[PDB]
Design an enzyme around this catalytic site. Structure first.
Site, PDB file in Angstrom:
ATOM      1  N   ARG A 157      -0.184   9.223   0.004  1.00  0.00           N
ATOM      2  CA  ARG A 157      -1.136   9.327   1.154  1.00  0.00           C
ATOM      3  C   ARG A 157      -0.617   8.562   2.388  1.00  0.00           C
ATOM      4  O   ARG A 157      -1.090   8.867   3.500  1.00  0.00           O
ATOM      5  CB  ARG A 157      -2.528   8.823   0.750  1.00  0.00           C
ATOM      6  CG  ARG A 157      -2.550   7.409   0.179  1.00  0.00           C
ATOM      7  CD  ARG A 157      -3.927   6.771   0.008  1.00  0.00           C
ATOM      8  NE  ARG A 157      -3.799   5.376  -0.416  1.00  0.00           N
ATOM      9  CZ  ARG A 157      -3.605   4.984  -1.675  1.00  0.00           C
ATOM     10  NH1 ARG A 157      -3.555   5.877  -2.648  1.00  0.00           N
ATOM     11  NH2 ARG A 157      -3.465   3.698  -1.962  1.00  0.00           N
ATOM     12  N   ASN A 158       0.290   7.591   2.203  1.00  0.00           N
ATOM     13  CA  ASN A 158       0.779   6.679   3.270  1.00  0.00           C
ATOM     14  C   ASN A 158       2.214   7.055   3.659  1.00  0.00           C
ATOM     15  O   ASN A 158       2.847   6.290   4.388  1.00  0.00           O
ATOM     16  CB  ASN A 158       0.627   5.215   2.851  1.00  0.00           C
ATOM     17  CG  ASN A 158      -0.823   4.781   2.818  1.00  0.00           C
ATOM     18  OD1 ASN A 158      -1.651   5.336   3.539  1.00  0.00           O
ATOM     19  ND2 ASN A 158      -1.140   3.807   1.976  1.00  0.00           N
ATOM     20  N   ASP A 217       1.228   3.067   7.529  1.00  0.00           N
ATOM     21  CA  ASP A 217      -0.028   2.412   7.089  1.00  0.00           C
ATOM     22  C   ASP A 217       0.309   0.965   6.721  1.00  0.00           C
ATOM     23  O   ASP A 217       0.514   0.669   5.518  1.00  0.00           O
ATOM     24  CB  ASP A 217      -0.719   3.204   5.973  1.00  0.00           C
ATOM     25  CG  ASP A 217      -2.224   2.975   5.938  1.00  0.00           C
ATOM     26  OD1 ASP A 217      -2.645   1.799   6.113  1.00  0.00           O
ATOM     27  OD2 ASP A 217      -2.965   3.973   5.787  1.00  0.00           O
ATOM     28  N   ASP A 257       0.853  -1.213   0.000  1.00  0.00           N
ATOM     29  CA  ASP A 257       0.000   0.000   0.000  1.00  0.00           C
ATOM     30  C   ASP A 257       0.879   1.250   0.000  1.00  0.00           C
ATOM     31  O   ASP A 257       0.449   2.268   0.567  1.00  0.00           O
ATOM     32  CB  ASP A 257      -0.962  -0.023   1.185  1.00  0.00           C
ATOM     33  CG  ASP A 257      -2.257   0.732   0.941  1.00  0.00           C
ATOM     34  OD1 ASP A 257      -2.440   1.222  -0.186  1.00  0.00           O
ATOM     35  OD2 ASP A 257      -3.079   0.802   1.883  1.00  0.00           O
TER      36      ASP A 257
END
Ligand SMILES: CC(C)c1cnc(N2CC(CS(C)(=O)=O)C2)c2cnc(Nc3ccnc(N4CC[C@@H](O)[C@@](C)(F)C4)n3)cc12
Length: 312
Positions: A139-140, A153, A135
């Site tokens: 955003r992470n 994350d 992932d």
């Protein structure tokens, strides 16, 4: 390594985010009346009673507690009640995707290429720990200071057996637009599928937060990849930077660069950043220094702590 704490030793001051993941709060560790009030981030499970949601946050907590590196987020602690709360480090500038979107007109070539190095160093660390993130995305990646980001994350992270090369996933909703083709088609994740995700992450950064394959629905992505279509060259990218990105998106996972190579190559490029990224007004662009960042904290901490006085 998983430190089970008392919920009552934590005060939620602000909601920083809410979504599928649940809710993230700015919180205070207050173990001794009034003496110590230490800022943390608290992620709270919404679906308290969901066996699946409990599995996901307890797997997340397990992986996140196992990681000790300057470019990865560690779990400080866990609270277990009717629900689960992860106690994590407060990252004052939130996620890198919101950051590059919000601060684009002040982000220079030196910051962009440093982030690339820092994320590769962190991913290289996870590879060495036998973790496949599954992932990696802008955003992470969270911003401690403008000069220091960390991967987080671990909700999808899988710990590989010794000398085991791949993880075969079951069904589930998957971040198609960040996944290697073999991951989409065959549910196969490796360190090299993470390198594809890293390529998209660099691409998110170099475009100051463009959505990958904007407009194209996820269902059409395996088809466009098979036809040799990839994410476009960001305007600020010289061909040498876009070539590293294209290498991360080769059909043959073993032809993709290694995180350790990406560290050597982005590091080289960061020594002469303006040769490799062409940004207008690059020479006169400024972001808060680490000392200016400590200030911003202290400013926001002051007004937040004052709002706890005109309430409770
Ligand atoms: C929504 C998350 C990413 C988030 C947002 N905003 C933050 N801010 C701090 C700033 C306000 S301040 C402090 O200046 O008053 C806006 C966040 C700050 N810290 C974190 N911390 C961490 C530390 C480690 N891992 C995560 N995760 C990983 C799991 C995800 O599901 C997550 C959303 F919980 C983020 N978050 C997050 C801030």
């Amino acid at each position: 390594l998983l430190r089970i704490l008392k919920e009552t030793e934590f005060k939620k001051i602000k909601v920083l985010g809410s979504g599928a993941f649940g809710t993230v709060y700015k919180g205070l560790w207050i173990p001794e009346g009034e003496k110590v009030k230490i800022p943390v981030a608290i992620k709270e499970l919404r679906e308290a009673t969901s066996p699946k949601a409990n599995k996901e946050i307890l797997d997340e907590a397990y992986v996140m507690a196992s990681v000790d590196n300057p470019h990865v987020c560690r779990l400080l602690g866990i609270c277990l009640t009717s629900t689960v709360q992860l106690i994590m480090q407060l990252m004052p500038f939130g996620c890198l995707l919101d950051y590059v979107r919000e601060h684009k007109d002040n982000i220079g070539s030196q910051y962009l290429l440093n982030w690339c190095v820092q994320i590769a160093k962190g991913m290289n660390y996870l590879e060495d720990r036998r973790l496949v993130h599954r992932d990696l995305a802008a955003r992470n990646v969270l911003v401690k200071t403008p000069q220091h980001v960390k991967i987080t994350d671990f909700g999808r992270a899988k710990l590989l057996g010794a000398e085991e090369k791949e993880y075969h996933a079951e069904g589930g909703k998957v971040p198609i637009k960040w996944m290697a083709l073999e991951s989409i088609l065959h549910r196969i994740y490796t360190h090299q599928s993470d390198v594809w995700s890293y390529g998209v992450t660099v691409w998110e950064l170099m475009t100051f937060g463009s959505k990958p394959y904007d407009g194209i629905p996820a269902s059409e992505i395996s088809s466009i990849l098979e036809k040799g279509e990839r994410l476009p060259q960001p305007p600020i990218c010289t061909i040498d930077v876009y070539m590293i990105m294209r290498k991360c998106w080769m059909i043959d996972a073993d032809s993709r660069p290694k995180f350790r190579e990406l560290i050597i190559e982005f590091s080289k490029m960061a020594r002469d950043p303006q040769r490799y990224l062409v940004i207008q007004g690059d020479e006169r662009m400024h972001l808060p220094s680490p000392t200016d960042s400590n200030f911003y904290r202290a400013l926001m901490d002051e007004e937040d702590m004052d709002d706890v006085v005109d309430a409770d």
